[PDB]
Amino acid sequence: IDECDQGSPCEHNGICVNTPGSYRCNCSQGFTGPRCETNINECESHPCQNEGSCLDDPGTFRCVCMPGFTGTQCEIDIDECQSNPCLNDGTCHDKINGFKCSCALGFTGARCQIN
Ligand SMILES: *[C@@H]1O[C@H](CO)[C@@H](O)[C@H](O[C@H]2OC[C@@H](O)[C@H](O)[C@H]2O)[C@H]1O
Ligand SMILES: *[C@@H]1O[C@H](CO)[C@@H](O)[C@H](O)[C@H]1NC(C)=O
Ligand SMILES: *[C@@H]1O[C@H](CO)[C@@H](O)[C@H](O)[C@H]1NC(C)=O
Ligand SMILES: *[C@@H]1O[C@H](CO)[C@@H](O)[C@H](O)[C@H]1O
Ligand SMILES: *[C@@H]1O[C@@H](C)[C@@H](O)[C@@H](O)[C@@H]1O
Ligand SMILES: [Ca+2]
Ligand SMILES: [Ca+2]
Secondary structure, eight states, X not given: OOSSTXXXXXXXXXXXXXXXXXXXXEOOTTEESTTSOEEOOGGGGOOOOTTOEEEXXXXXXXXXXXXXXXXXXXXXXXXXXXXXXXXXXXXXXXXXXXXXXXXXXXXXXXXXXXX
């Protein structure tokens, strides 16, 4: 009694393996259950942060981030001050999807561009 050779009961192209008196199914990525019938949806753990959208494939997820965020789970608040936008020795303060400049004395404008 091969049991597997009489016809595999595994779904989702899982591999039937004989066990003493029975069988087990070894599933491909993204599936589980005794016969590989359960789809694992990695978005069920709500991995995408900061109002990102979660997209599912077997074995994986992808987050689509709101502006201002990056990383696999949208967990990184991008530092928009990296590019030193505040001119004339201004001080850049990072914001969500933006920055604010505190301008030295004698300068003004969103980026301290005015004198
Ligand atoms: C970094 O400095 C450059 C100019 O040197 C600006 O182009 C960038 O401003 C952009 O991307 C992030 C947005 O939040 C900003 O409003 C936008 O200007 C600045 O990040
Ligand atoms: C999920 O499927 C894998 C792959 O076959 C299996 O090793 C594991 O035991 C399953 N998990 C549960 C909780 O059934
Ligand atoms: C971060 O987001 C930018 C787009 O804003 C993208 O180019 C980059 O690949 C992302 N990095 C990671 C680690 O998700
Ligand atoms: C559930 O959320 C965790 C992160 O917290 C992630 O690692 C899994 O991929 C996801 O299904
Ligand atoms: C998935 O992407 C995110 C960034 C938001 O725009 C959501 O409204 C969308 O459903
Ligand atoms: Ca899935
Ligand atoms: Ca930011």
